[PDB]
């Protein structure tokens, strides 16, 4: 109730360091999903699909 056992959690390793996902975007060929704003800033294109 006081030790590290409190604010931390013991768990399995996983070399990958963390399943992170990626986002596809086909700005020039598919309508921009619901709330996405249309733009030209590569780092903000609309997203059409997510995947690990």
């Amino acid at each position: 109730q006081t030790g590290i056992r409190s604010w931390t959690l013991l768990c399995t390793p996983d070399v990958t360091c963390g399943s992170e996902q990626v986002y596809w975007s086909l700005p020039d060929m598919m309508q921009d999903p619901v709330t996405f704003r249309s733009t030209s800033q590569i780092s903000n294109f609309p997203v059409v699909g997510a995947e690990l």
């Binding site: 992170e20 996902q21 309508q31 921009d32 999903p33 619901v34 709330t35 996405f36 704003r37 903000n44 997203v47 059409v48 997510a50």
Partner: protein
Amino acid sequence: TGGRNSIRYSELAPLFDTTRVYLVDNKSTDVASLNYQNDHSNFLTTVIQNNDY
């Protein structure tokens, strides 16, 4: 279908028929502000993916 499609959002224009909303945790702006005290098994997400709000 006909007039029954329209999926609308504030001023951003009419989108028609199926589209996609995303439920994600790792969204940076969210963390800091909403689910600070929460964890991956019970969090809040902003489903509005609009950069300006």
